[PDB]
Amino acid sequence: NPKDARHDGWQTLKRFLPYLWPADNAVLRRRVVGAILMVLLGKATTLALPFAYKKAVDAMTLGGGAQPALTVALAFVLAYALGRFSGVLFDNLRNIVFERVGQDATRHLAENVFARLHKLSLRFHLARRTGEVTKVIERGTKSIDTMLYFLLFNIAPTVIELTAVIVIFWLNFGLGLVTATILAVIAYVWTTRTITEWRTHLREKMNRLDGQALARAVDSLLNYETVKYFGAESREEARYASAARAYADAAVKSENSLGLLNIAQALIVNLLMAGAMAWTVYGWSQGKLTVGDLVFVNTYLTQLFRPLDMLGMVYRTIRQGLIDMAEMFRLIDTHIEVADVPNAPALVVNRPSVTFDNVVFGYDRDREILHGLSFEVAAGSRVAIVGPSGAGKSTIARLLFRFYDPWEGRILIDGQDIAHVTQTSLRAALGIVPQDSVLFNDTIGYNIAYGRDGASRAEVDAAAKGAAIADFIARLPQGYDTEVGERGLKLSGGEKQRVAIARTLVKNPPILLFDEATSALDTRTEQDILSTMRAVASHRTTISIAHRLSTIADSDTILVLDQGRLAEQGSHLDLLRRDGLYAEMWARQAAESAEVSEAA
Amino acid sequence: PKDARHDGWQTLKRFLPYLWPADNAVLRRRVVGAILMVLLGKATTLALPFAYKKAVDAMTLGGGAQPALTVALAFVLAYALGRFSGVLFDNLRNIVFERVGQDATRHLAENVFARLHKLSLRFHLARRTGEVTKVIERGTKSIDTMLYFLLFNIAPTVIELTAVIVIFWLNFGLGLVTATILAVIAYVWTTRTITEWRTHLREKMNRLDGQALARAVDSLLNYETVKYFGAESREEARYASAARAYADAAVKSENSLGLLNIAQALIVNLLMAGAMAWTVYGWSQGKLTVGDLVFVNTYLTQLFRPLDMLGMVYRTIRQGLIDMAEMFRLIDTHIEVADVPNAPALVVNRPSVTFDNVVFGYDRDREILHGLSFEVAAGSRVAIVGPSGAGKSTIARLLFRFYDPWEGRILIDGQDIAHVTQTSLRAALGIVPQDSVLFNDTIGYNIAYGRDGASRAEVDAAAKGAAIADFIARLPQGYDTEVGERGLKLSGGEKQRVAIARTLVKNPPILLFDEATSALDTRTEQDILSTMRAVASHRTTISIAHRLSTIADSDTILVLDQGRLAEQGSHLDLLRRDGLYAEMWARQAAESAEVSEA
Ligand SMILES: CCCCCCCCCCCC[N+](C)(C)[O-]
Ligand SMILES: CCCCCCCCCCCC[N+](C)(C)[O-]
Ligand SMILES: CCCCCCCCCCCC[N+](C)(C)[O-]
Ligand SMILES: CCCCCCCCCCCC[N+](C)(C)[O-]
Ligand code: MET
Ligand code: MET
């Protein structure tokens, strides 16, 4: 089991590897093989061509059996040029071919993570900032992609070439040459890495300061009026100038350290150039080596250290990518709190009754909210759930869609423990109008159509009518194609709740929940929409959870919760008659409504 | 001057004074230093392949292994030292000039910031923080990249290209010269056209990425809703397709990159083949040495190494020059409201406010005030009310002179506010706007904002005067409490009290409440109204309110209709005239009843 290992880069990459070698596609497997073959051809070519250079030199200095020397040299020079062009071609062909492999791989990883995120429990509250989260995911995507590219198309070939060059230097020179270049590459890597850590620290500081300056400027601009009102121009300008200066200093330091890494790098490389070319020419002096061997060794070395010119950035980015990807898998690895049981059957709603059987529950184990709540909602009946501040009614909706499970006890629909049925069918039996209805960044038509997967234009029309929002849409310039939400037309509160009613209508569920539906609304809007809602609840089981008792007074029966249990149960008149908790409540709210009316 | 072809050249010619300040002698020294490292670096890198040529020549000239060893050692060592030194010079010019670049782009930014604060309000300076920040980030990155590439890639490459024309001319060719010239021209042209096509593909690819990501994020931030309608599979499929679209776009874009590189290498290596062949054929005739093969090869590879990236460079430079142009457009846009030449200060000895037949509208095709006239006597509490077309929402902005009247004038004391310095004018005016805005800073900074050198004593006094002092007391950090986002979120009454406090610190003779209570709940309104009444103590006060009840106790009330003064007088006088104010009053009262009925 791969998860039973050390949590380092290697483990991340071993986890990512199946995405590159699917066994499910085979097309991409072919693309992978093709790409590796282009890598091998590219290396073959770039390693081959400098011998063509050497041979051209030899033919011009030992024209003893290389004759006519003109023809031999011309042949080898053209061989070399053609070699260069071909090495390039093989490289871009491996890039192009593998691009599809990379995009598909990271795409499937992204898809898996998305799915899992939609499987995890609500308690993570993934309702935050669009701009921040998007800056983060953008950042991470750029990160993982860059590490992917650098790994497959810089580090891998450079290791191939590094070993090939070791082999060739071993068989044809040295071996002092081999130990010299290996010592060289080790020093270059150690140096680049240690310096790069320092540079990454400086880089982060520069980016923090930049953010601060930009933020200052932006905050000043979006507040032009206020800056005008209090004549604070000079103040704001100076206030930006200091931040700006701070940034400039940070940037100067950062771009200086870049210079030091470059100098250290060139120092190492060019000592090795000096030493190796000296040894080669001296070796020629003794009649052991040709003059073409100078050209050969030199070209071999510059070709070797060209890709390592970027090692710093590469190292910074790859490292970071591997960090981000660890995180990806960490999410995929987090366990799912609410899961379907194995071979779960579907919920079969023949007669839509609702049962709470002794439910104990709380969002956290150190604060219990339902203390053994029990009740029966009869099929087709309309009931309400009211109670004071600790009653625990705001758990009901969430327990019913099974966003969470009870600590103890159960919830049934038609006599079926909803914890033993498939979550999708369970939620298929449920409608909800929430207090805060949210709109997708899309058209009002799409948002209404959302209630059911394959919804027709007719179904949408029918529902918008049944919610009484059809006329409002008719008067819109673009009608159903009107873009709404953020970045689009702002809808009123009543309108949004009407869209929501419409949605649940498209879904047409056998059980409907109003979960503080109108508590976000003004009084007249509430009064208006209450009639609409009253209409929609016609022949369904409906459960209304409300702060204001008056808006639910017409219930077939009312459930009164206190301290997480069922305190009172019955018709509005029975409850006012018992002079118990519901009565008290009623009275108090009434008093409030009176007092507020006086202040005019 | 500004009278030019408005092309990259004009932008750059304009940016040049920033690199050669004449105000800063130090940075001028730094520029001379950087240019000197450019010349040392080029001298060096053009020289070091001569060292290579001689070492090859030494080994082939060349009877045996004579003192050729010593010479060859000497020249290869010279070559290596040369390479290193070229790099050294390059990074030193980078380092030396970095300060120049940073200062220059800083002062340009500072100029733009400054002018933007002089330019007129009507530039709709209300958007999204993330959008403007992403934009400004984008553009600064742009200009920096464009600047670096220009100065430290294209410039040295032009220097080096000309050097190579000279050298190839004097020592070979001249067919060699014309061959490399034709090579570079084809390389440039090819790289340019392919880059234009590639930029279009890149733009498409970015749009597609954005769309896919947006779909994912909007899906997650609405987890609850997706759960409610069991729409997981649906949203997943919705992301897969957008994601595939993006992938295809990416593949296409990176393919076009492949073609750009292949074409580039074709040009470079055709030139390499021809030049090296002709060099060898020249050796065969004993005219050129064997070191000349190495020499020509090295010169050509060194020449075309910086043009390796010409694609990106050209894209980048292009965009940078665009973005910089944009900067200058701002600096060049004319300032709608200016102080007249030698404008005197406003002197407020008697704080009367006079509107004299003011005609105004934000745009010339929609007139709002059609000759508005009134006198606000010094020290009085006056309100300005009216129905939907009265034009009352203009008063505040006209009084602070965000705009001048089309016709007519505004006086404070006896003085035309269009003939005085804006700062003295605004120093005489305090304002509590409808949406009070808080800076991302401490409550102390926000209140102290009201006057430049405001003491903590003054902050205390004002916060007391606005009755928010006690609230601040119960804060852990008190006045050092960070507010705004990401800071403590304040209630509406609290924000309006911070605002009142601010204007208190200013201590102006004229105070405006501009729909001050229109964003607040009823109890909050009633609360803060008494503070607002207290604060009006020895000032001229103008309250502009939608809800008439909140201004009934004014000394006199100004009633505007269709951009003119219809009625004027005390609350009772006005109800007594049975006119417009009366009607409004009744109507408003009636509404308060209906909501109470429900
Ligand atoms: C799967 C390919 C693209 C996925 C996008 C990357 C996700 C962003 C990074 C997640 C968290 C990063 N970190 C470590 C800073 O928290
Ligand atoms: C509509 C666009 C207006 C843009 C002008 C704003 C210039 C302000 C300076 C921001 C620069 C931040 N910096 C340079 C530190 O990155
Ligand atoms: C240190 C860098 C300071 C330079 C400030 C440049 C900000 C550029 C914003 C330009 C946006 C132009 N536009 C409309 C094409 O996006
Ligand atoms: C806070 C971490 C959550 C990240 C999980 C989201 C996965 C789907 C988004 C991938 C974006 C792919 N992109 C940007 C290339 O289109
Ligand atoms: C092509 S950016 C090179 C920067 C430096 N040579 C490094 O290794 O980080
Ligand atoms: C990763 S640098 C690629 C440079 C490319 N040859 C161009 O000029 O666009």
Give the integer Cα–Cα distance in Å for A396 and A411.
10
Give the integer Cα–Cα distance in Å for B582 and A173.
108
According to DSSP, the β-strands at A565-570 and A557-562 are antiparallel
Residues 6+ apart with CB under 8 A from B501: B447, B450, B459, B462, B463, B465, B466, B468
Residues 6+ apart with CB under 8 A from B232: A115, A118, A119, B226
What are A186's two structure tokens? 């080790």
Contacts of B268 in chain A (CB under 8 A): 84
Q: Is B124 left (phi over 0), alpha (psi -120 to 50) or beta?
A: left
Contacts of B73 in chain A (CB under 8 A): 278, 281-282
Give the integer Cα–Cα distance in Å for A387 and A559.
8
Q: What are phi and psi of B523, to 5 degrees?
A: -65, -45
Q: Which amino acid is at B469?
A: A
Going from the Cα of B135 to the center of ligand 3, the distance in angstroms, rounded, reads 7
DSSP A307: G
Give the integer Cα–Cα distance in Å for B373 and B354.
8
Contact A118 B236 (CB under 8 A): yes
Residues in chain B: 598
| CA dist list (Å): B8 to A218, A231, B35, B505 | 28, 37, 22, 49
CA atoms within 13 A on the CB side of B142: 17
> CB of B551 within 8 A of CB of B591?
no
Give the CATH number of domain B342-598. 3.40.50.300
Decide: residue B132, CB within 10 A, 0-12 exposed, 13-18 middle, 19+ buried. middle
Contact A270 B80 (CB under 8 A): yes
Q: Is A356 left (phi over 0), alpha (psi -120 to 50) or beta?
A: beta
> CB of B323 within 8 A of CB of B13?
no
CA atoms within 13 A on the CB side of A15: 24
Looking at ligand 6, which residue's alpha carbon is closest to its atom 4?
Answer: B309
> CB of A192 within 8 A of CB of A311?
yes
Q: B543: which strand partners?
A: B383, B513
Give the integer Cα–Cα distance in Å for B450 and A232.
9
Nearest to A357 by CA among A401, A415, A425: A415
What are B51's two structure tokens? 């060292």
Query: The dihedral of CA B36, B37, B39, B44: what is its sign?
Result: positive
Type and span of the H or E element at A557: strand A557-562
What are B397's two structure tokens? 């902005």
DSSP B393: G
Q: Which amino acid is at A266?
A: A
Alpha-helical runs (H) found in A123-175 = 130-150, 156-172
Residues 6+ apart with CB under 8 A from B48: B78, B79, B82, B83, B86
**Which of A130, A263, A599 comes nearest B87 by C-beta?**
A263
Q: Which amino acid is at B306?
A: P
Give the integer Cα–Cα distance in Å for A191 and A264.
8
SS3 category, A582:
helix
Nearest-Cα distance to chain B for A533, in Å, is: 18
Nearest to B248 by CA among B279, B306, B208, B293: B208
Give the integer Cα–Cα distance in Å for A482 and A489.
8
Residues 6+ apart with CB under 8 A from A567: A387, A560, A561, A580, A581
Query: The dihedral of CA A209, A211, A217, A223: what is its sign?
Result: negative
Candidates B220, B425, B442, partner chain A, best to mutate (most A CBs within 10 A): B220
Across the beta sheet with B407-412, what order do the strands follow? B369-376, B353-360, B407-412, B415-416
Decide: residue A354, CB within 10 A, 0-12 exposed, 13-18 middle, 19+ buried. buried
Give the integer Cα–Cα distance in Å for A135 and A132.
5
DSSP A362: -
Helix axes A156-172, A176-221, angle to 10 degrees: 160
Query: The dihedral of CA A207, A210, A215, A218: what is its sign?
Result: negative
What are A100's two structure tokens? 């599809």
What are B298's two structure tokens? 């090295």
Max distance between CA atoms of chain B, in angstroms, equals 126
According to DSSP, the β-strands at B510-514 and B429-432 are parallel
CB neighbourhood size of A258 (10 A): 19
Nearest to B254 by CA among A324, A95, A343, A137: A95
Contact A230 B91 (CB under 8 A): no
Q: Is the peptide bond before A406 cis (omega within 30 degrees of 0)?
A: no
Type and span of the H or E element at A80: helix A69-119
Q: State which of A126, A137, A145 you would mutate to test the pocket of ligand 4, scoring each by most atoms of that ligand within 8 A of its C-beta.
A: A137
Candidates A27, A225, A290, A306, partner chain B, best to mutate (most B CBs within 10 A): A225
> CB of B152 within 8 A of CB of B91?
no
Task: Encode B183-211 in three state secondary structure.
Answer: HHHHHHHHHHHHHHHHHHHHHHHHHHHHH
SS3 category, B62:
coil
Candidates B115, B217, B232, B548, partner chain A, best to mutate (most A CBs within 10 A): B217
Nearest-Cα distance to chain A for B126, in Å, is: 6
**Resolution in Å, one decimal place:** 3.0
Nearest to A70 by CA among B55, B278, B176: B278
> CB of B569 within 8 A of CB of B557?
yes
Q: Is A343 left (phi over 0), alpha (psi -120 to 50) or beta?
A: left
> CB of A510 within 8 A of CB of A349?
yes
According to DSSP, the β-strands at A370-377 and B429-432 are unpaired
Nearest to A593 by CA among A534, A560, A535, A547: A547
> CB of B583 within 8 A of CB of B576?
no
Residues 6+ apart with CB under 8 A from B592: A600
The dihedral formed by the CA atoms of A441, A443, A445 and A447, expressed in degrees to the nearest 10 = 10
What are A421's two structure tokens? 């049925």
Give the integer Cα–Cα distance in Å for B46 and B43.
5
What are A468's two structure tokens? 């009484």
Contact B60 A56 (CB under 8 A): no
**Topology classification of domain A343-600:** Rossmann fold (3.40.50)
Type and span of the H or E element at B467: none
Nearest to B559 by CA among B549, B569, B550: B569
Type and span of the H or E element at B123: none
Residue that has been written with the tokens 């005197």 in this structure: B344
**Which of B62, B227, B247 comes nearest A103 by C-beta?**
B247
DSSP B479: G
Type and span of the H or E element at B145: helix B129-149
Give the integer Cα–Cα distance in Å for B232 and B146.
45
CB neighbourhood size of B193 (10 A): 12
> CB of B380 within 8 A of CB of B538?
no
Give the integer Cα–Cα distance in Å for A277 and B56.
11
Give the CATH number of domain B1-341. 1.20.1560.10
According to DSSP, the β-strands at B381-385 and B556-561 are parallel
Give the integer Cα–Cα distance in Å for B403 and B414.
20
SS3 category, B395:
helix
> CB of B325 within 8 A of CB of B12?
no
Give the integer Cα–Cα distance in Å for B553 and B559.
15
Q: B29: which strand partners?
A: none
Give the integer Cα–Cα distance in Å for B218 and B229.
15
Query: How many H-runs (helices) and E-runs (strands) does chain A carry?
Result: 19, 12
DSSP string, A386-450: E--TTS-GGGHHHHHTTSS--SEEEEEETTEEGGGS-HHHHHHTEEEE-SS----SEEHHHHHHT
Q: How many CB pairs under 8 A join A and B?
A: 327
> CB of A109 within 8 A of CB of A328?
yes
Estimate to the nearest angstrom the gap between the alpha carbon of A3 and the chain centroid: 22
Going from N- to C-terminal start, the domains of chain B cover: 1-341, 342-598
Gyration radius of chain A over CA positions:
36
What are A60's two structure tokens? 């011009």
- Spell out the long-range contacts of B406-409 with Cβ–Cβ below 8 A and sequence spacing 24 or more: B406/B359, B406/B360, B406/B361, B406/B364, B406/B367, B407/B357, B407/B358, B407/B359, B407/B360, B407/B371, B408/B355, B408/B356, B408/B357, B408/B358, B408/B359, B408/B371, B408/B372, B408/B373, B409/B356, B409/B357, B409/B358
B421 is in an annotated binding site: no
> CB of A483 within 8 A of CB of A440?
no
Nearest-Cα distance to chain A for B151, in Å, is: 15
Residue that has been written with the tokens 């950087």 in this structure: B34
CA atoms within 13 A on the CB side of B228: 27
| Cα-based angle A99, A101, A107 (whole degrees, multiple of 5) | 100
Residues 6+ apart with CB under 8 A from B142: B316, B319, B320, B323
Q: B541: which strand partners?
A: B381, B511
Give the integer Cα–Cα distance in Å for B209 and A15.
25
A310 is in an annotated binding site: yes
What are A198's two structure tokens? 């320092």
Residues 6+ apart with CB under 8 A from B162: none
Using the CB atoms, write b or e for B148-187: b if 16+ within 10 Å: bbbbbbbebbeebbebbbeebeeebbeebbebbeebbebb
Give the integer Cα–Cα distance in Å for A335 and A119.
9
Give the integer Cα–Cα distance in Å for B103 and B467.
46
Contacts of B482 in chain A (CB under 8 A): none
Give the integer Cα–Cα distance in Å for A162 and A182.
9
SS3 category, A484:
strand
Q: What are phi and psi of A246, to 5 degrees?
A: -50, -50
| Cα-based angle A517, A522, A524 (whole degrees, multiple of 5) | 100
DSSP string, B399-445: HTTSS--SEEEEEETTEETTSS-HHHHHHTEEEE-SS----SEEHHH
Domain A1-342, second-level architecture: Up-down Bundle (1.20)
Nearest to A298 by CA among A169, A198, A457: A169
Gyration radius of chain B over CA positions:
36
According to DSSP, the β-strands at A565-570 and B415-416 are unpaired
> CB of A127 within 8 A of CB of A177?
no
Residues 6+ apart with CB under 8 A from A503: A447, A448, A450, A451, A463, B229
Give the integer Cα–Cα distance in Å for B260 and A298.
28
Nearest to A328 by CA among A118, A106, A113: A113
Give the integer Cα–Cα distance in Å for B482 and B444.
9
What are B79's two structure tokens? 């070559």
- Spell out the long-range contacts of A584-593 with Cβ–Cβ below 8 A and sequence spacing 24 or more: A585/A386, A585/A388, A585/A549, A586/A549, A589/A548, A589/A549, A589/A550
DSSP A367: B
Give the integer Cα–Cα distance in Å for B258 and B159.
29
